[PDB]
Amino acid sequence: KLSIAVFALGCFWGPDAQFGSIKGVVSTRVGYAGGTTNNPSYYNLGDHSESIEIQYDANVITYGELLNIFWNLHNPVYETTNRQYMSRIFYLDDGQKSEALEMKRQIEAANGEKIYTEIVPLENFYLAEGYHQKYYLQNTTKLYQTLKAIYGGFGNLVRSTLAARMNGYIAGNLSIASLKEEMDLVELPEDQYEKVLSIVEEIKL
């Protein structure tokens, strides 16, 4: 059992890569939330926002730390009506709601600007299409195919911690030194470790 945060802050590729780089984030998936239609998709979104679901270990990272990251990834000081890209925190319980409200207040006080992030109850989150998941990794063909085989297929790969970290590495949000420590955690047979490392190193160059 893990804890869940669901945030919306624009195109979800960046947040996937950013949050996926953080210790305590166990897995990520991108999708759609905030609207009033069942089973939305990319070109049929209705009123939903591009969102990220963050499965985190509360023993390692707090909701407050995730909120801090959220408000450091974008600066939502404009009011738009563009649902697809709007800044939203979808709270799952009253603790999340109160923490979000309090931090929003502190940001507004510290920097003198109204924040337009909507803090609203999570209704339904709908998983986005496969091609959107771990976007940067998925489009790094050799690394992607190697990790996919090791993890036993697409679904297993995208649900993994290592894929979240690898996607972050490709996007430039995780150092190779930190990535190697993450690789060590998975306890790969040494051949697979060396094969993945060579791709990762050749990527860093």
Side-chain angles (χ1 to χ4, degrees):
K1 176 178 190 180
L2 292 164
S3 303
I4 299 282
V6 181
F7 296 151
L9 59 156
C11 174
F12 48 29
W13 300 333
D16 194 4
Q18 295 272 8
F19 280 104
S21 300
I22 310 298
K23 183 67 53 172
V25 173
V26 179
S27 62
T28 60
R29 62 191 190 143
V30 300
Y32 311 118
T36 51
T37 55
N38 302 294
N39 300 327
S41 57
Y42 202 55
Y43 296 115
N44 182 35
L45 260 184
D47 33 359
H48 291 277
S49 304
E50 287 189 26
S51 294
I52 182 185
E53 174 195 303
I54 301 153
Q55 189 159 356
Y56 67 101
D57 185 347
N59 298 295
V60 176
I61 189 167
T62 64
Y63 192 65
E65 289 167 88
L66 292 174
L67 293 170
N68 183 64
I69 295 166
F70 172 82
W71 272 307
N72 278 318
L73 289 175
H74 70 309
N75 195 36
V77 295
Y78 321 103
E79 194 187 7
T80 88
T81 63
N82 303 324
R83 306 287 301 250
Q84 182 163 351
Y85 300 122
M86 268 159 35
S87 183
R88 302 172 142 167
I89 293 162
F90 301 101
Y91 59 82
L92 281 79
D93 56 52
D94 286 340
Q96 291 193 349
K97 177 190 201 200
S98 60
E99 292 188 45
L101 288 172
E102 176 61 14
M103 190 175 291
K104 179 174 167 183
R105 292 189 285 259
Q106 292 162 337
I107 293 172
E108 292 177 329
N111 310 109
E113 278 179 300
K114 186 179 187 55
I115 286 294
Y116 286 91
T117 305
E118 303 178 335
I119 295 163
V120 291
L122 174 66
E123 182 230 32
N124 299 327
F125 172 92
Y126 303 88
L127 185 68
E129 297 85 342
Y131 74 88
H132 281 304
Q133 307 295 338
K134 304 300 180 298
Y135 186 75
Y136 300 112
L137 170 60
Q138 184 172 166
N139 288 279
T140 308
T141 301
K142 192 184 158 142
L143 183 60
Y144 170 64
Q145 292 291 337
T146 302
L147 291 175
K148 184 150 68 54
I150 290 169
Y151 275 79
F154 176 83
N156 285 347
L157 179 61
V158 302
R159 286 186 296 264
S160 71
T161 303
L162 190 64
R165 303 286 191 273
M166 287 273 176
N167 188 49
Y169 172 72
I170 301 292
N173 305 321
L174 193 67
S175 74
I176 188 174
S178 293
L179 183 66
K180 291 165 64 184
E181 302 176 336
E182 294 282 351
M183 289 171 53
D184 287 340
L185 290 181
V186 180
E187 294 175 355
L188 296 169
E190 294 295 333
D191 59 311
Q192 295 184 341
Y193 174 91
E194 292 300 331
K195 262 92 169 220
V196 172
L197 177 63
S198 175
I199 300 173
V200 162
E201 283 181 346
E202 126 215 335
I203 287 166
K204 193 191 180 176
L205 285 166

mmCIF file of all heavy atoms in Angstrom, residues 137-165:
data_model
loop_
_atom_site.group_PDB
_atom_site.id
_atom_site.type_symbol
_atom_site.label_atom_id
_atom_site.label_comp_id
_atom_site.label_asym_id
_atom_site.label_seq_id
_atom_site.Cartn_x
_atom_site.Cartn_y
_atom_site.Cartn_z
ATOM 1 N N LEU A 137 11.822 8.276 -22.014
ATOM 2 C CA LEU A 137 12.409 6.937 -22.043
ATOM 3 C C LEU A 137 11.876 6.149 -23.236
ATOM 4 O O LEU A 137 12.643 5.533 -23.977
ATOM 5 C CB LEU A 137 12.105 6.176 -20.740
ATOM 6 C CG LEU A 137 12.453 4.677 -20.735
ATOM 7 C CD1 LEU A 137 13.946 4.435 -20.974
ATOM 8 C CD2 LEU A 137 12.029 4.004 -19.440
ATOM 9 N N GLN A 138 10.558 6.178 -23.421
ATOM 10 C CA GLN A 138 9.922 5.386 -24.476
ATOM 11 C C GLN A 138 10.466 5.749 -25.855
ATOM 12 O O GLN A 138 10.510 4.909 -26.768
ATOM 13 C CB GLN A 138 8.394 5.554 -24.427
ATOM 14 C CG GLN A 138 7.654 4.683 -25.424
ATOM 15 C CD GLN A 138 6.146 4.689 -25.245
ATOM 16 O OE1 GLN A 138 5.411 4.244 -26.129
ATOM 17 N NE2 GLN A 138 5.677 5.174 -24.101
ATOM 18 N N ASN A 139 10.902 6.997 -25.998
ATOM 19 C CA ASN A 139 11.434 7.466 -27.269
ATOM 20 C C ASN A 139 12.958 7.454 -27.345
ATOM 21 O O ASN A 139 13.548 8.039 -28.261
ATOM 22 C CB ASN A 139 10.851 8.836 -27.621
ATOM 23 C CG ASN A 139 9.382 8.748 -28.021
ATOM 24 O OD1 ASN A 139 9.052 8.418 -29.165
ATOM 25 N ND2 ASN A 139 8.496 9.024 -27.079
ATOM 26 N N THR A 140 13.577 6.780 -26.376
ATOM 27 C CA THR A 140 15.010 6.468 -26.393
ATOM 28 C C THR A 140 15.135 4.971 -26.671
ATOM 29 O O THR A 140 15.276 4.155 -25.758
ATOM 30 C CB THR A 140 15.658 6.831 -25.052
ATOM 31 O OG1 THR A 140 15.326 8.190 -24.736
ATOM 32 C CG2 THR A 140 17.180 6.678 -25.113
ATOM 33 N N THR A 141 15.098 4.630 -27.955
ATOM 34 C CA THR A 141 14.756 3.279 -28.397
ATOM 35 C C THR A 141 15.584 2.133 -27.806
ATOM 36 O O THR A 141 15.020 1.160 -27.309
ATOM 37 C CB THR A 141 14.730 3.205 -29.940
ATOM 38 O OG1 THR A 141 13.766 4.147 -30.429
ATOM 39 C CG2 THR A 141 14.347 1.808 -30.410
ATOM 40 N N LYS A 142 16.907 2.240 -27.852
ATOM 41 C CA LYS A 142 17.745 1.142 -27.378
ATOM 42 C C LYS A 142 17.592 0.910 -25.869
ATOM 43 O O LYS A 142 17.438 -0.231 -25.420
ATOM 44 C CB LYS A 142 19.214 1.369 -27.756
ATOM 45 C CG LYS A 142 20.084 0.139 -27.552
ATOM 46 C CD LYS A 142 21.555 0.425 -27.831
ATOM 47 C CE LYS A 142 22.441 -0.602 -27.135
ATOM 48 N NZ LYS A 142 23.627 -0.995 -27.949
ATOM 49 N N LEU A 143 17.625 1.995 -25.092
ATOM 50 C CA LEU A 143 17.451 1.896 -23.646
ATOM 51 C C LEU A 143 16.059 1.366 -23.316
ATOM 52 O O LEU A 143 15.909 0.493 -22.463
ATOM 53 C CB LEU A 143 17.665 3.263 -22.977
ATOM 54 C CG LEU A 143 17.594 3.290 -21.450
ATOM 55 C CD1 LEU A 143 18.639 2.385 -20.836
ATOM 56 C CD2 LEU A 143 17.751 4.719 -20.940
ATOM 57 N N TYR A 144 15.054 1.895 -24.007
ATOM 58 C CA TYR A 144 13.660 1.500 -23.797
ATOM 59 C C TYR A 144 13.457 0.007 -24.050
ATOM 60 O O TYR A 144 12.863 -0.688 -23.231
ATOM 61 C CB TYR A 144 12.750 2.329 -24.709
ATOM 62 C CG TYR A 144 11.305 1.871 -24.764
ATOM 63 C CD1 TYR A 144 10.500 1.912 -23.636
ATOM 64 C CD2 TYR A 144 10.746 1.425 -25.959
ATOM 65 C CE1 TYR A 144 9.168 1.496 -23.688
ATOM 66 C CE2 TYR A 144 9.418 1.019 -26.029
ATOM 67 C CZ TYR A 144 8.637 1.053 -24.890
ATOM 68 O OH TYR A 144 7.319 0.646 -24.951
ATOM 69 N N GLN A 145 13.957 -0.489 -25.179
ATOM 70 C CA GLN A 145 13.742 -1.892 -25.528
ATOM 71 C C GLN A 145 14.481 -2.823 -24.573
ATOM 72 O O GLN A 145 13.990 -3.899 -24.235
ATOM 73 C CB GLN A 145 14.136 -2.152 -26.989
ATOM 74 C CG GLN A 145 13.215 -1.468 -28.004
ATOM 75 C CD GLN A 145 11.811 -2.071 -28.031
ATOM 76 O OE1 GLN A 145 11.609 -3.220 -27.632
ATOM 77 N NE2 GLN A 145 10.837 -1.295 -28.502
ATOM 78 N N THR A 146 15.653 -2.392 -24.119
ATOM 79 C CA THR A 146 16.453 -3.182 -23.200
ATOM 80 C C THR A 146 15.763 -3.293 -21.839
ATOM 81 O O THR A 146 15.647 -4.381 -21.274
ATOM 82 C CB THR A 146 17.856 -2.565 -23.046
ATOM 83 O OG1 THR A 146 18.476 -2.501 -24.338
ATOM 84 C CG2 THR A 146 18.716 -3.390 -22.111
ATOM 85 N N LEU A 147 15.308 -2.163 -21.314
ATOM 86 C CA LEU A 147 14.614 -2.163 -20.027
ATOM 87 C C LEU A 147 13.254 -2.863 -20.128
ATOM 88 O O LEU A 147 12.829 -3.534 -19.188
ATOM 89 C CB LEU A 147 14.451 -0.734 -19.500
ATOM 90 C CG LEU A 147 15.757 -0.060 -19.066
ATOM 91 C CD1 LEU A 147 15.518 1.394 -18.670
ATOM 92 C CD2 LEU A 147 16.383 -0.835 -17.908
ATOM 93 N N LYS A 148 12.577 -2.709 -21.260
ATOM 94 C CA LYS A 148 11.274 -3.348 -21.421
ATOM 95 C C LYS A 148 11.398 -4.870 -21.358
ATOM 96 O O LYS A 148 10.598 -5.532 -20.706
ATOM 97 C CB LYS A 148 10.605 -2.928 -22.729
ATOM 98 C CG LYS A 148 9.201 -3.503 -22.892
ATOM 99 C CD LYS A 148 8.303 -2.586 -23.708
ATOM 100 C CE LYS A 148 8.757 -2.517 -25.156
ATOM 101 N NZ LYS A 148 8.858 -3.886 -25.748
ATOM 102 N N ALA A 149 12.410 -5.414 -22.024
ATOM 103 C CA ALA A 149 12.635 -6.862 -22.001
ATOM 104 C C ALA A 149 12.961 -7.340 -20.582
ATOM 105 O O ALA A 149 12.435 -8.356 -20.112
ATOM 106 C CB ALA A 149 13.745 -7.240 -22.963
ATOM 107 N N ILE A 150 13.829 -6.596 -19.900
ATOM 108 C CA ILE A 150 14.218 -6.920 -18.532
ATOM 109 C C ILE A 150 13.020 -6.917 -17.578
ATOM 110 O O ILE A 150 12.909 -7.777 -16.696
ATOM 111 C CB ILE A 150 15.301 -5.932 -18.028
ATOM 112 C CG1 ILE A 150 16.627 -6.184 -18.750
ATOM 113 C CG2 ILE A 150 15.465 -6.012 -16.522
ATOM 114 C CD1 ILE A 150 17.667 -5.099 -18.505
ATOM 115 N N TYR A 151 12.114 -5.957 -17.761
ATOM 116 C CA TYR A 151 10.951 -5.842 -16.881
ATOM 117 C C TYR A 151 9.771 -6.711 -17.297
ATOM 118 O O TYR A 151 8.781 -6.784 -16.577
ATOM 119 C CB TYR A 151 10.519 -4.378 -16.702
ATOM 120 C CG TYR A 151 11.315 -3.724 -15.596
ATOM 121 C CD1 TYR A 151 12.610 -3.279 -15.829
ATOM 122 C CD2 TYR A 151 10.800 -3.611 -14.308
ATOM 123 C CE1 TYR A 151 13.367 -2.716 -14.817
ATOM 124 C CE2 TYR A 151 11.556 -3.046 -13.285
ATOM 125 C CZ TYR A 151 12.834 -2.603 -13.551
ATOM 126 O OH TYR A 151 13.592 -2.039 -12.553
ATOM 127 N N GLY A 152 9.871 -7.372 -18.445
ATOM 128 C CA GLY A 152 8.823 -8.298 -18.853
ATOM 129 C C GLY A 152 7.676 -7.670 -19.623
ATOM 130 O O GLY A 152 6.568 -8.225 -19.684
ATOM 131 N N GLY A 153 7.916 -6.502 -20.206
ATOM 132 C CA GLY A 153 6.906 -5.893 -21.046
ATOM 133 C C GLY A 153 6.582 -4.455 -20.691
ATOM 134 O O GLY A 153 7.057 -3.920 -19.684
ATOM 135 N N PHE A 154 5.745 -3.838 -21.515
ATOM 136 C CA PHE A 154 5.447 -2.413 -21.390
ATOM 137 C C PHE A 154 4.830 -2.014 -20.050
ATOM 138 O O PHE A 154 5.307 -1.082 -19.386
ATOM 139 C CB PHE A 154 4.535 -1.964 -22.536
ATOM 140 C CG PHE A 154 4.103 -0.531 -22.429
ATOM 141 C CD1 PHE A 154 4.935 0.493 -22.874
ATOM 142 C CD2 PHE A 154 2.865 -0.204 -21.883
ATOM 143 C CE1 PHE A 154 4.540 1.821 -22.775
ATOM 144 C CE2 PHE A 154 2.464 1.123 -21.777
ATOM 145 C CZ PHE A 154 3.304 2.133 -22.224
ATOM 146 N N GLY A 155 3.749 -2.691 -19.670
ATOM 147 C CA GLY A 155 3.054 -2.374 -18.435
ATOM 148 C C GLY A 155 3.936 -2.486 -17.207
ATOM 149 O O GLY A 155 3.924 -1.598 -16.346
ATOM 150 N N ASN A 156 4.691 -3.579 -17.104
ATOM 151 C CA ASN A 156 5.609 -3.746 -15.980
ATOM 152 C C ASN A 156 6.662 -2.650 -15.939
ATOM 153 O O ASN A 156 7.016 -2.157 -14.868
ATOM 154 C CB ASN A 156 6.338 -5.088 -16.049
ATOM 155 C CG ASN A 156 5.465 -6.254 -15.653
ATOM 156 O OD1 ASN A 156 4.382 -6.070 -15.104
ATOM 157 N ND2 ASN A 156 5.942 -7.468 -15.921
ATOM 158 N N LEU A 157 7.195 -2.308 -17.106
ATOM 159 C CA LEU A 157 8.230 -1.278 -17.180
ATOM 160 C C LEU A 157 7.686 0.066 -16.696
ATOM 161 O O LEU A 157 8.260 0.692 -15.800
ATOM 162 C CB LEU A 157 8.785 -1.149 -18.606
ATOM 163 C CG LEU A 157 9.873 -0.079 -18.787
ATOM 164 C CD1 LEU A 157 11.097 -0.374 -17.931
ATOM 165 C CD2 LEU A 157 10.270 0.058 -20.255
ATOM 166 N N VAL A 158 6.562 0.503 -17.253
ATOM 167 C CA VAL A 158 6.097 1.846 -16.921
ATOM 168 C C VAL A 158 5.632 1.983 -15.478
ATOM 169 O O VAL A 158 5.626 3.084 -14.941
ATOM 170 C CB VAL A 158 5.061 2.406 -17.918
ATOM 171 C CG1 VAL A 158 5.647 2.424 -19.332
ATOM 172 C CG2 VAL A 158 3.779 1.612 -17.872
ATOM 173 N N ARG A 159 5.273 0.869 -14.842
ATOM 174 C CA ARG A 159 4.864 0.908 -13.435
ATOM 175 C C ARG A 159 6.048 0.882 -12.469
ATOM 176 O O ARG A 159 5.873 1.065 -11.257
ATOM 177 C CB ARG A 159 3.917 -0.251 -13.106
ATOM 178 C CG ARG A 159 2.511 -0.079 -13.674
ATOM 179 C CD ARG A 159 1.575 -1.202 -13.189
ATOM 180 N NE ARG A 159 1.993 -2.514 -13.683
ATOM 181 C CZ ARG A 159 1.491 -3.095 -14.770
ATOM 182 N NH1 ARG A 159 0.547 -2.481 -15.474
ATOM 183 N NH2 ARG A 159 1.929 -4.292 -15.157
ATOM 184 N N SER A 160 7.251 0.668 -12.997
ATOM 185 C CA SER A 160 8.419 0.486 -12.132
ATOM 186 C C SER A 160 9.035 1.788 -11.645
ATOM 187 O O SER A 160 8.885 2.847 -12.273
ATOM 188 C CB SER A 160 9.498 -0.341 -12.823
ATOM 189 O OG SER A 160 10.122 0.391 -13.858
ATOM 190 N N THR A 161 9.723 1.698 -10.512
ATOM 191 C CA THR A 161 10.514 2.817 -10.020
ATOM 192 C C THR A 161 11.683 3.124 -10.953
ATOM 193 O O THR A 161 11.938 4.292 -11.275
ATOM 194 C CB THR A 161 11.043 2.548 -8.604
ATOM 195 O OG1 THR A 161 9.939 2.267 -7.726
ATOM 196 C CG2 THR A 161 11.821 3.768 -8.092
ATOM 197 N N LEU A 162 12.399 2.095 -11.395
ATOM 198 C CA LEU A 162 13.569 2.350 -12.238
ATOM 199 C C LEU A 162 13.198 3.081 -13.530
ATOM 200 O O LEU A 162 13.960 3.928 -13.982
ATOM 201 C CB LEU A 162 14.360 1.072 -12.547
ATOM 202 C CG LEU A 162 15.721 1.326 -13.218
ATOM 203 C CD1 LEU A 162 16.665 2.115 -12.286
ATOM 204 C CD2 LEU A 162 16.378 0.018 -13.656
ATOM 205 N N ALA A 163 12.047 2.766 -14.123
ATOM 206 C CA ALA A 163 11.639 3.455 -15.350
ATOM 207 C C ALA A 163 11.361 4.917 -15.075
ATOM 208 O O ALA A 163 11.642 5.769 -15.913
ATOM 209 C CB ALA A 163 10.405 2.823 -15.958
ATOM 210 N N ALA A 164 10.765 5.202 -13.919
ATOM 211 C CA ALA A 164 10.482 6.587 -13.547
ATOM 212 C C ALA A 164 11.799 7.368 -13.432
ATOM 213 O O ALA A 164 11.907 8.521 -13.892
ATOM 214 C CB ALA A 164 9.684 6.650 -12.227
ATOM 215 N N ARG A 165 12.795 6.742 -12.811
ATOM 216 C CA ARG A 165 14.115 7.371 -12.647
ATOM 217 C C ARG A 165 14.838 7.508 -13.981
ATOM 218 O O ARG A 165 15.491 8.523 -14.232
ATOM 219 C CB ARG A 165 14.988 6.580 -11.667
ATOM 220 C CG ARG A 165 14.363 6.397 -10.279
ATOM 221 C CD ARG A 165 14.379 7.678 -9.414
ATOM 222 N NE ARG A 165 14.014 7.314 -8.042
ATOM 223 C CZ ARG A 165 12.766 7.251 -7.584
ATOM 224 N NH1 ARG A 165 11.744 7.584 -8.366
ATOM 225 N NH2 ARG A 165 12.541 6.859 -6.334
#
